[PDB]
């Protein structure tokens, strides 16, 4: 059984937009004729605070959809989740994690 | 072979929306510099987006000297098929809808996160020092401007009570223009408009090497058809981002009654056959016309703010755009 | 391939160098975000100007000289014709002297406007780059009227004075130009002094002391911008 | 032709066509910006003469040859240190005595 | 219904105050932020005593129980961090690392461990096991420049993140063997057939349950982490992260599998007869002091599993009384490992020799805590082992108590080897501290918490067997709420 | 597509990450094989939620928390890789065996 | 705090509001440009 | 109608195990990390067929967009141009790991096939974004608040384990005996 | 989608009268009329693209009366 409605066109549109580069690069294929990066830990540290906050935002998407269907108790509980991770943002500023 | 007519007719609108934006880029930026723009081709430059794209098909797309062949070719493909796929979300037209997914403003913000990987296999696979440096610089910039971009969508998700983009434009249709979310979220519009512009436009980007931090960025060794995905796919990302400004905050297919005078951006006659075709076609693609205003505003904003450096770009998404996106989500709630 | 090491990374600015100030090549080495050393590789435009003049007469070398400082133009012809006219004691007439002041002060405006456009794009805002060159095109036609060329290759300076007098509608056409350009000089100044993001890229960035400026050997608006007040038109 | 440095200059290649093939030549010193747009127009008339089945001569031919030499390899002159070179920090002895 | 998690949410608040003070004050807060976490741990201990009288409610929609068993193990993990903070007030303050940043990761492992003891959902078991495990990889590599703590943070990661995936695949199977039912009481009502799917779900979860308690086929991280990690973290994972794995195993293997019970009581005997042998014979061949206590914690784990496999009301009372007195033996021995590692470097055996005339409070602390670890009278570890063999003899298991006694004499020989090189070596036989001992002060920063964590632990090691009768009644009330 | 083909796919993905856990010599490929294990227990879990008790999806909530922990197990895990690399200048699992016996 | 991001945002989001207006007034002016092959400019 | 949901399953079920063989068996480590997103995107395509449209988009946001980018940033930081090619280092101990991996698979395929699964014939996913947010605050509430303390700790610890020691690297603060900065006081020695 | 009723009213006959308007008043148009002039390009752009090589905006030859 598959009770999701709207995904009948998602399979073909996944194939058609995949057929946009693989055929245009083929339609072009018939018409055409001291090496160091310095180890600076800022690419990893900027991605480190991304993973902590991409998990933050994905926990807020079910709360934001069902927000007026939960009540005031589930709003204080969702506020403890944010206010703990607000200190996570304050920790990233003061410890010069995202200074670049 | 393109059997769904809702998939074909949308795709014609989905490619002519890009070709407007390449035309509007070269003509609005010419008006702010008091020059013409592309004349002599088409009538007034109408074929200039077509001519810039068709020359990249006919050129010898050669690889660099010692490069990873499979990661070089799939380099621009990771950047642009995530922004070609999420055109299934954009709901232009009252009777025109391609797919009624239960989400899609969250699917778009999920699909836009594959794009930092394509900037990593474009910098690495080109196999020079200045593009790997531009690869890590372009990737860590779109990383920085996504959590402010995802939190602006969280603001219009509380007011719409869902992520359905048909339901999002349905909450802005009860009063025409007084019920738009830009009037209810004046701050989160700016959190959306700066963070989306820092991932598709030309102003907060080091790909033009006017500061010479690299050779030419990550898209240095790319030429021909592979650069056509980098050139004619950054305007796909510009129109797609501007399509969602005209869906979330501004009401998609929402406009007042057209029974007005000659000064309603229309003709002179009240009952005109030219206005019966400018009302039916506008009833098919309305939020494209609204997205042509923020495409125009994106070109107009390029020549206002300074070309800011990367140290102050990443100190804006994290130090400024993320706390103003957090407090907007709280002000959207009760608190 | 490209590896990730811990030593300081040296990047080559390259003789390609897509800029409007010639062709440099800086082997600048980086320490993450700060530079620690940089050698400039020059000579990519060394056409042998000094060896040429030993087989040129003065009227055969006057076209050659306006290619060293090709932003300026007739500032190169100023030094050229002044080398035998101050050695042979050849008197320059007073009217031809004031035309030389008129032409050189218009070149310094065009020298600074060609400096200003690329400098404003390198420090930020790119939109004055197209409005500054329009103001230099008015100075081009003031030289294109009096001489036969736009900004260089304008054989105007001579040993006994200047090549020819001005055109008829010329002196009234600075009074159209340099009464219109002078309001825009303060407009260019308020781009960086106001909007206090540009001052955070120019305050203390590339600072040189007064004592090191005279020792390293400097002149013009780089020496005088350290507090020296040395100008060879006054000195 | 390396125009004014074509008479006596020890380092100027006389004309870019001693290195790369040229489509349109443009005299002038310097040419007017109107005169470059003629050379674009003369170039645009040359692109339309190009044929689609004559797309094979656009690629370079490869007549490779190989010879072994006995030249002494030299270390590179321009290494990437200017200020941190060990001759800028202090003047050497047998020269600062007479200073 | 959020009044049952009050001992954990007081530790949540003081976790944030010692974090913000590192950001606000900036290393000037290290003079007071350990002592604020002590009363934060003491205030979390003192609120478990009003919760002891409550009649064991199941709060948070059936996902958390507040019984006496969950409150006993909550106090053991809170006392484990209370003893660790009294140690690491000088230890990581001498490495130059931040003191407030250490005690934040130390308190997330505490509240992560304290929530394991009362969890009843498959997800809250895994979430609280994660934040105990994720916090402990950061603590074993907290010094970050040693090539020994970095090597110990790696081996603990690639086994800890591995064994928590074996634990998840058995936890996900428990969601699928029942028709949903992530809660452990709802699991037992759905599955009782003892199929092969329940067996693989049982083996997969005791690859991670018996990874925190370090049984021998899953013990391989323990002797390599415990010599590379900072010694207070070594003191924490031996009584805090080890009792939390024992807090899980009673709450998991008795609630999720009361039908399948003769199988995990057969596996955990193999886990006991292997960790009693290999914990106590390989500790003979150890020279490092932290490595001798590493195989000790594997060996003392097999004594706790003696009461776990018998499955009686006195058997589960024998493993809770032994784990209670185990905190007074490790945290008193590891205090003297730290207090010897701070005066002189290189804390290993055959460098403690020639002592007892220069540091007599260290040798009286280290002997009486290592002799009690061998189980000699009249110390606390003697009575703890007596109750394990009394409950072992009570219901079968005659070979486990014989192996528990024969490996207790092999346990004596390497513990008395350290007491040999502390008190019986002549003053012409000392290698380190040969007129090199720094003439102890108890006036520098953090030495007075290090001394009171030694005095109040050996007193709790010498007198907890004589005065065991209040502790025997405090433990036996935590067993009636165990199926 | 039945329930059985999802769990075999999750069990095969488990043993590919198991093989990558023991055979990989670079320390980052071991962490990439750990993410194969934590997606095996998620592919096992949503299939257990789609076919068993799909009205109140308790597996998809539990599948969210595994994604969050593995996001925090890799961020902590890669800071351990960068901590060894600053001291021991390679990433080679046959070179960290100095705490042997 | 929360009473600062409504006041630290106004100081430049209105400066670009007075910058979007002047660039739109740059489009108000006639394009002063010499279209070459149909308006060749007379030499001096 | 029904076969188009099955032929897209095995096209994705083969896309995950081929990419999972690419992250394990490939000699290049960067090729493993780009194919690691091929594992994660194919599993995210498998969740849409399994009526998990939220967790599908929650995998592209985290596993593809956050974890795989974090992996790739932490592989371009470790190249060193040194593989050293010591394949047979000690013995053929890569064959003992092929025994257990095929053994666990032979265990579980025996377990998956013979177990009677009590699958329910009820209609699933009644707008499954609200039933997952009602679950974050009724049943799974205490896991939801502890995930913030887990993330805050993962931002505290992974910063202090990866930041550059540029504050005071030659820092001998005190001493009873000599201890190096940012290192454990138990100094290494041979017995 | 209609076949030839309303498609040709947008693709064929109305872009021809915009091209009569775009050729006549594009440079002489004011600041308010050019903003509406840019709207007619972006709205009729699928129709303006088809009849692009069939109209030229090149200026007429002069008379040279001097």
TrEMBL record, chain F:
Subcellular location: Cellular thylakoid membrane; Membrane
Record GO biological process: ATP synthesis coupled electron transport; photosynthesis, light reaction
UniProt-listed Enzyme Commission number(s): 7.1.1.-
Pfam assignment, any one: Oxidored_q2
Topological relation to the membrane, as annotated: Multi-pass membrane protein
Top-level taxon of the source organism: Bacteria
Keywords carried by this UniProt record: Membrane, NAD, NADP, Plastoquinone, Quinone, Thylakoid, Translocase, Transmembrane, Transmembrane helix, Transport
Coiled-coil annotated residue ranges, if any: none
Predominant place of localization: membrane
GO molecular function, one term: quinone binding
Reaction catalyzed: a plastoquinone + NADPH + (n+1) H(+)(in) = a plastoquinol + NADP(+) + n H(+)(out); a plastoquinone + NADH + (n+1) H(+)(in) = a plastoquinol + NAD(+) + n H(+)(out)
InterPro entries: NADH_UbQ_OxRdtase_chain4L/K, NUOK/Mnh_C1-like
UniProt enzyme class: translocase
UniProt protein name: NAD(P)H-quinone oxidoreductase subunit 4L
Species: Thermosynechococcus vestitus (strain NIES-2133 / IAM M-273 / BP-1)
Gene name for this UniProt entry: ndhE
From TrEMBL, chain H:
Chain segments annotated as transmembrane: 3-26, 33-50, 56-79, 91-113, 140-162
EC numbers, comma separated: 7.1.1.-
Keywords on record: Cell membrane, Membrane, NAD, Quinone, Transmembrane, Transmembrane helix
Subcellular location: Cell membrane
Topology of the protein relative to the lipid bilayer: Multi-pass membrane protein
Principal location class: membrane
PANTHER family cross-referenced by the UniProt entry: NADH-UBIQUINONE OXIDOREDUCTASE CHAIN 6
Coiled-coil zones: none
GO CC entries: plasma membrane; transmembrane transporter complex
Domain of life of the native organism: Bacteria
Protein family (similarity comment): Belongs to the complex I subunit 6 family.
Catalysed transformations (reactions): a plastoquinone + NADH + (n+1) H(+)(in) = a plastoquinol + NAD(+) + n H(+)(out); a plastoquinone + NADPH + (n+1) H(+)(in) = a plastoquinol + NADP(+) + n H(+)(out)
UniProt cross-references to Pfam families, sorted A to Z: Oxidored_q3 (PF00499)
Lineage of origin: Bacteria, Bacillati, Cyanobacteriota, Cyanophyceae, Acaryochloridales
Protein name, per record: NADH-quinone oxidoreductase subunit J
Role summary: NDH-1 shuttles electrons from NADH, via FMN and iron-sulfur (Fe-S) centers, to quinones in the respiratory chain. Couples the redox reaction to proton translocation (for every two electrons transferred, four hydrogen ions are translocated across the cytoplasmic membrane), and thus conserves the redox energy in a proton gradient.
Any GO molecular function: quinone binding
């Amino acid at each position: 059984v598959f009770v999701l409605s709207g995904y009948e066109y998602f399979l073909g549109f996944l194939i058609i937009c995949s057929l946009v580069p693989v055929l245009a690069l083929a339609a072009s294929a018939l018409l055409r004729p001291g090496a160091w990066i310095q180890f600076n830990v800022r690419y990893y540290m900027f991605a480190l605070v991304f993973v902590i906050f991409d998990v933050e935002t994905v926990f807020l998407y079910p709360w934001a959809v069902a927000f007026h269907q939960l009540g005031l108790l589930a709003f204080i509980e969702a506020l403890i989740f944010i206010a703990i991770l607000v200190v996570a943002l304050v920790y990233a500023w003061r410890k010069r994690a995202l200074e670049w | 072979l393109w059997l769904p007519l809702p998939m074909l007719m949308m795709l014609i609108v989905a490619t002519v929306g890009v070709l407007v934006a390449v035309w509007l880029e070269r003509k609005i930026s010419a008006a702010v510099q008091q020059r013409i723009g592309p004349e002599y081709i088409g009538p007034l430059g109408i074929l200039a987006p077509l001519a810039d794209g068709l020359k990249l098909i006919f050129k010898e797309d050669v690889l660099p000297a010692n490069s990873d062949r499979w990661l070089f070719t799939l380099g621009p493909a990771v950047v642009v098929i995530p922004v070609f796929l999420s055109y299934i979300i954009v709901p232009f037209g009252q009777n025109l809808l391609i797919s009624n997914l239960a989400m899609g403003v969250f699917l778009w913000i999920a699909l836009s996160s594959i794009a930092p990987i394509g900037l990593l296999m474009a910098g690495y696979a080109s196999n020079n020092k200045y593009s790997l440096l531009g690869g890590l610089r372009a990737a860590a910039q779109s990383i920085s401007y996504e959590i402010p971009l995802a939190l602006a969508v969280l603001a219009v998700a509380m007011m719409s009570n869902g992520l359905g983009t048909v339901e999002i434009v349905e909450q802005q249709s009860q009063y025409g223009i007084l019920s738009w979310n830009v009037w209810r979220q004046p701050i989160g519009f700016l959190v959306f408009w700066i963070a989306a512009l820092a991932e598709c436009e030309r102003l907060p980007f080091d790909l033009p090497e006017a500061e010479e931090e690299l050779v030419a960025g990550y898209q240095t060794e790319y030429a021909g058809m592979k650069f056509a995905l980098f050139y004619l796919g950054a305007y796909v990302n510009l129109v797609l981002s501007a399509l969602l400004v005209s869906v979330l905050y501004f009401g998609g297919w929402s406009f007042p009654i057209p029974l007005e005078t000659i000064a309603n951006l229309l003709g002179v006659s009240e009952t005109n056959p030219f206005l019966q075709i400018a009302f039916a076609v506008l009833g098919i693609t309305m939020t494209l016309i609204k997205a042509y205003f923020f495409v125009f505003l994106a070109i107009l904003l390029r020549w206002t703010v300074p070309r800011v450096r990367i140290d102050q770009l990443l100190d804006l998404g994290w130090k400024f755009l993320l706390p103003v996106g957090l407090v907007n989500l709280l002000l959207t709630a009760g608190l | 391939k490209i590896e990730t090491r811990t030593e300081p990374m040296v990047i080559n600015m390259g003789p390609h160098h897509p800029s409007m100030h010639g062709v440099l090549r800086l082997m600048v080495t980086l320490d993450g975000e700060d530079v620690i050393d940089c050698e400039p590789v020059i000579g990519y435009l060394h056409r042998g100007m000094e060896k040429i003049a030993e087989n040129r007469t003065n009227i055969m070398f006057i076209p050659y000289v306006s290619r060293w400082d090709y932003a300026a133009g007739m500032f190169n012809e100023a030094v050229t014709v002044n080398a035998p006219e101050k050695l042979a004691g050849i008197p320059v007439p007073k009217r031809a002297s004031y035309i030389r002041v008129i032409m050189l002060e218009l070149n310094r405006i065009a020298n600074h406007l060609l400096w200003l456009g690329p400098f404003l794009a390198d420090v930020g805002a790119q939109t004055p780059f197209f409005y500054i060159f329009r103001e230099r095109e008015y100075i081009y036609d003031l030289f294109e009227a009096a001489t036969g060329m736009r900004f260089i290759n304008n054989n105007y300076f001579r040993i006994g004075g200047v090549a020819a007098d001005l055109t008829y509608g010329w002196v009234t056409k600075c009074r159209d130009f340099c009464d219109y350009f002078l309001p825009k000089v303060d407009e260019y100044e308020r781009l960086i002094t106001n909007n206090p993001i540009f001052v955070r890229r120019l305050q203390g960035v590339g600072k040189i002391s007064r004592e090191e400026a005279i020792n390293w050997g400097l002149s013009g608006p780089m020496l005088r911008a350290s507090g020296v007040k040395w100008d060879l038109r006054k000195v | 032709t390396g125009g004014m440095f074509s008479s006596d200059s020890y380092s100027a290649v006389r004309g870019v066509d001693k290195l790369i093939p040229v489509d349109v030549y443009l005299p002038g010193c310097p040419p007017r910006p109107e005169a470059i747009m003629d050379a674009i127009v003369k170039l645009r008339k040359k692109i339309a003469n190009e044929h689609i089945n004559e797309r094979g001569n656009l690629a370079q031919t490869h007549r490779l040859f190989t010879a072994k030499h006995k030249m002494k390899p030299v270390p590179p002159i321009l290494t990437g240190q200017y200020l941190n070179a060990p001759s800028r920090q202090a003047p050497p002895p047998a020269l600062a005595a007479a200073m | 219904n959020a009044g049952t998690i009050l001992p954990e949410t007081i530790l949540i608040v003081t976790l944030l105050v010692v974090l913000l003070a590192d950001l606000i004050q900036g290393r000037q807060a290290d003079r007071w932020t350990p002592y604020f976490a002590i009363v934060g741990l003491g205030g979390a201990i003192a609120t478990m005593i009003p919760l002891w009288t409550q009649p064991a409610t199941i709060s948070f929609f059936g996902s958390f129980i507040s019984d006496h068993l969950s409150l006993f193990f909550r106090g053991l993990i809170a006392l484990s961090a209370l003893g660790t903070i009294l140690m690491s007030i000088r230890y990581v303050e001498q490495t130059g690392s931040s003191l407030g940043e250490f005690m934040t990761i130390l308190l997330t492992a505490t509240v992560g461990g304290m929530f394991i003891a009362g969890a009843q959902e498959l997800v809250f078991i895994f979430v609280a096991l994660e934040t105990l495990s994720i916090a402990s990889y950061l603590l074993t590599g907290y010094t970050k420049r040693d090539s020994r703590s970095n090597e110990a943070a790696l081996k603990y990661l690639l086994i800890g993140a591995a064994s928590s995936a074996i634990f998840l695949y058995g936890s996900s199977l428990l969601y699928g063997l029942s028709g949903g039912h992530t809660q452990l009481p709802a699991i037992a009502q759905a599955l009782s057939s003892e199929s092969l799917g329940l067996v693989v779900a049982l083996v997969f979860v005791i690859a991670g349950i018996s990874f925190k308690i370090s049984a021998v086929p899953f013990h391989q991280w323990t002797p390599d982490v415990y010599e590379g990690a900072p010694t207070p973290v070594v003191a924490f994972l031996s009584v805090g992260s080890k009792a939390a794995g024992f807090a899980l195993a009673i709450r998991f293997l008795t609630l999720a599998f009361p039908s399948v019970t003769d199988q995990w009581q057969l596996i955990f005997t193999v886990l006991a007869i292997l960790s009693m042998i290999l914990g106590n014979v390989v500790a003979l061949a150890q020279t490092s002091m932290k490595r001798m206590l590493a195989y000790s914690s594997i060996g003392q784990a097999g004594f706790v599993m003696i009461g776990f496999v018998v499955g009686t009301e006195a058997g589960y009372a024998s493993m809770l009384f032994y784990l209670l007195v185990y905190l007074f033996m490790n945290l008193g021995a590891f205090t003297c490992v730290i207090l010897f590692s701070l005066r002189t470097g290189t804390d290993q055996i055959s460098e403690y020799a020639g002592l007892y005339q220069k540091d007599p409070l260290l040798t009286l602390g280290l002997s009486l805590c290592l002799l009690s670890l061998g189980g000699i009278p009249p110390l606390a570890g003697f009575f703890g082992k007596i109750y394990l063999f009394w409950a072992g003899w009570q219901a079968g298991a005659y070979g486990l108590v014989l192996l528990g006694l024969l490996t207790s004499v092999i346990s004596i020989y390497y513990y008395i080897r350290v007491v040999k090189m502390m008190v019986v070596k002549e003053p012409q036989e000392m290698s380190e501290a040969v007129r090199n001992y720094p003439e102890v002060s108890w006036s520098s920063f953090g030495l007075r918490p290090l001394q009171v964590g030694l005095v109040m632990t050996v007193i709790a090691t010498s007198l907890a067997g004589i005065l065991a009768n209040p502790l025997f009644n405090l433990v036996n009330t935590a067993v009636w709420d165990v199926p | 597509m039945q329930l059985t083909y999802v769990l075999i796919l999750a069990a095969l993905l488990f043993c590919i990450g198991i093989y990558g856990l023991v055979t990989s010599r670079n320390a980052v490929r071991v962490l990439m094989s750990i993410e194969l294990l934590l997606n095996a227990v998620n592919l096992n879990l949503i299939g257990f939620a789609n076919y068993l008790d799909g009205q109140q999806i308790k597996g998809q909530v539990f599948a969210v928390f595994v994604i969050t922990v593995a996001a925090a197990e890799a961020a902590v895990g890669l800071a351990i890789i960068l901590a060894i690399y600053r001291n021991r200048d390679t990433v080679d699992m046959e070179k960290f065996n100095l705490l042997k016996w | 705090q929360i009473t600062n991001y409504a006041k630290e945002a106004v100081q430049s989001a209105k400066y670009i509001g007075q910058g979007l207006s002047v660039t739109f007034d740059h489009m108000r002016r006639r394009p002063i440009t010499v279209q070459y092959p149909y308006e060749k400019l007379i030499p001096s | 109608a029904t076969l188009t949901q099955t032929i897209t399953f095995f096209a994705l079920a083969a896309a995950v195990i081929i990419a999972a063989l690419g992250v394990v068996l490939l000699d290049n480590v960067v090729y493993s990390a780009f194919l690691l997103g091929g594992v994660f995107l194919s599993i995210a395509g498998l969740y849409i067929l399994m009526n998990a449209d939220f967790v599908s988009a929650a995998q592209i946001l985290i596993y593809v967009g956050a974890v795989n980018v974090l992996i790739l940033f932490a592989i371009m930081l470790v190249n060193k141009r040194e593989t050293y090619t010591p394949v047979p280092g000690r013995w053929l101990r890569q064959g003992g790991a092929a025994v257990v991996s095929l053994g666990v698979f032979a265990l579980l395929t025996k377990m998956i096939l013979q177990t009677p699964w009590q699958l329910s014939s009820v209609p699933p996913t009644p707008d499954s974004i609200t039933t997952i947010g009602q679950h974050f605050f009724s049943d799974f509430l205490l896991p939801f608040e502890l995930a913030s303390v887990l993330l805050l700790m993962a931002l505290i610890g992974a910063v202090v384990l990866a930041r550059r020691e540029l504050v005071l690297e030659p820092e001998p603060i005190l001493g009873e005996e000599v201890v190096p900065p940012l290192e454990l006081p138990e100094r290494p020695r041979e017995p | 989608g209609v076949y030839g009723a309303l498609a040709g009213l947008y693709l064929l006959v109305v872009p021809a009268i915009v091209y009569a308007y775009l050729n006549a008043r594009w440079y002489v148009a004011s600041s308010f009329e050019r903003a509406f002039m840019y709207f007619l390009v972006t709205f009729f752009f699928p129709g303006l693209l088809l009849l692009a090589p069939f109209i030229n905006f090149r200026p007429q030859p002069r008379s040279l009366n001097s």
